[PDB]
Design an enzyme around this catalytic site. Sequence first.
Site, PDB file in Angstrom:
ATOM      1  CG  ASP A  35      -1.847   1.177   1.281  1.00  0.00           C
ATOM      2  OD1 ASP A  35      -1.929   1.939   0.295  1.00  0.00           O
ATOM      3  OD2 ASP A  35      -2.508   1.338   2.329  1.00  0.00           O
ATOM      4  CB  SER A 199      -1.950  14.186 -13.751  1.00  0.00           C
ATOM      5  OG  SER A 199      -2.285  13.921 -15.099  1.00  0.00           O
TER       6      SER A 199
HETATM    7  N1  LIG Z   1      -4.254   3.398   0.434  1.00  0.00           N
HETATM    8  C1  LIG Z   1      -4.229   4.084   1.710  1.00  0.00           C
HETATM    9  C2  LIG Z   1      -5.047   5.370   1.645  1.00  0.00           C
HETATM   10  C3  LIG Z   1      -6.426   5.325   1.755  1.00  0.00           C
HETATM   11  C4  LIG Z   1      -7.159   6.500   1.694  1.00  0.00           C
HETATM   12  C5  LIG Z   1      -6.508   7.710   1.521  1.00  0.00           C
HETATM   13  C6  LIG Z   1      -7.295   9.011   1.458  1.00  0.00           C
HETATM   14  F1  LIG Z   1      -8.634   8.745   1.488  1.00  0.00           F
HETATM   15  F2  LIG Z   1      -6.949   9.779   2.533  1.00  0.00           F
HETATM   16  F3  LIG Z   1      -6.984   9.673   0.307  1.00  0.00           F
HETATM   17  C7  LIG Z   1      -5.130   7.752   1.412  1.00  0.00           C
HETATM   18  C8  LIG Z   1      -4.399   6.580   1.470  1.00  0.00           C
HETATM   19  N1  LIG Z   2      -6.253   1.580   1.289  1.00  0.00           N
HETATM   20  C1  LIG Z   2      -5.764   0.583   2.224  1.00  0.00           C
HETATM   21  C2  LIG Z   2      -6.801  -0.532   2.268  1.00  0.00           C
HETATM   22  C3  LIG Z   2      -6.620  -1.671   1.504  1.00  0.00           C
HETATM   23  C4  LIG Z   2      -7.570  -2.677   1.536  1.00  0.00           C
HETATM   24  C5  LIG Z   2      -8.695  -2.534   2.328  1.00  0.00           C
HETATM   25  C6  LIG Z   2      -9.740  -3.645   2.357  1.00  0.00           C
HETATM   26  F1  LIG Z   2      -9.944  -4.081   1.080  1.00  0.00           F
HETATM   27  F2  LIG Z   2      -9.304  -4.680   3.130  1.00  0.00           F
HETATM   28  F3  LIG Z   2     -10.906  -3.155   2.866  1.00  0.00           F
HETATM   29  C7  LIG Z   2      -8.880  -1.391   3.087  1.00  0.00           C
HETATM   30  C8  LIG Z   2      -7.930  -0.385   3.055  1.00  0.00           C
END
Ligand SMILES: NCc1ccc(C(F)(F)F)cc1
Ligand SMILES: NCc1ccc(C(F)(F)F)cc1
Length: 330
Positions: A35, A199
């Site tokens: 992630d 972008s």
């Molecule tokens: N993949 C992690 C993640 C999930 C949500 C956000 C948000 F909503 F803050 F943009 C940032 C990072």
């Molecule tokens: N953005 C991080 C993240 C990744 C996967 C999930 C899930 F799929 F497990 F809900 C939640 C949050």
Amino acid sequence: STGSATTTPIDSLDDAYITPVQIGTPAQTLNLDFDTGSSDLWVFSSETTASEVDGQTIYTPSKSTTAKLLSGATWSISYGDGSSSSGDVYTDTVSVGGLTVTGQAVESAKKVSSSFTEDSTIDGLLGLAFSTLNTVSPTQQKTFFDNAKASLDSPVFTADLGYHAPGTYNFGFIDTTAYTGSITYTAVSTKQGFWEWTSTGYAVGSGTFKSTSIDGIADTGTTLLYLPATVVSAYWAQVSGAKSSSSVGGYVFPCSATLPSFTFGVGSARIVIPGDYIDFGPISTGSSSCFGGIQSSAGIGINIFGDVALKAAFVVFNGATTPTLGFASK
Ligand SMILES: NCc1ccc(C(F)(F)F)cc1
Ligand SMILES: NCc1ccc(C(F)(F)F)cc1
């Protein structure tokens, strides 16, 4: 040193990607969701509330000769989708595709939200944003990438996500056989802890390219592409019968429609997302309404270049002292 690991979609829609990670001594292999939008390495464990575990592989620190409890340390995280988890912290040895880090903070989940329990294929997350977002208290901890940086041949990792197919995460080197043409690098702001970039614009299908600055984050942990309402309206206006549905929570379209591609700008270069990448299938089993892979960021507060966009490219995460992002066609 370098590392290389295959990453695999968890289902037929590429909702997420899992990558095997070795933790502890002897190795306990867990499948983690890499992630780039978060900075905590956390896992289902022997400490997780038993009712909240449904098929996941668990980390058992008591069976690892290298695990050490980090005294007094706790963690708690909330993701932008409303998911959350929390627990305590161990340090242990962590290896990704041959690349080993000793003394990595491994955050053991005591409590996880329902969305994690219901996802039997994901044993945890491996965060790859900047360490300023790590939630360990009272002593913030470093990410796997930050800990590995010094020993990597080059302070980079690359994401090569597949469309309905396996892909690769590489650490410490750039595979010049994995992309076509040249890599275009663009500046990154770390001010919010994300791989945040700008972008240079977009196009819908074969239409004219619109030069306009779109600030957003490169997030392997988010499934879809979230862009400003003006851009998303322009895209779905080219799909006959598409509409925004408040009951479904986004743009849907008749499953019989063909979707146009979507182009986004990286400097003077262009990344083309094929229309098929934007189809996320029926909103419910048997339905003829399908869910779109490009949605509005209006309710989120930030634009997110998630898997839908990243899997159309070879993506370099350059963690040099001045960080940059590289995009190449593939
Ligand atoms: N993949 C992690 C993640 C999930 C949500 C956000 C948000 F909503 F803050 F943009 C940032 C990072
Ligand atoms: N953005 C991080 C993240 C990744 C996967 C999930 C899930 F799929 F497990 F809900 C939640 C949050």
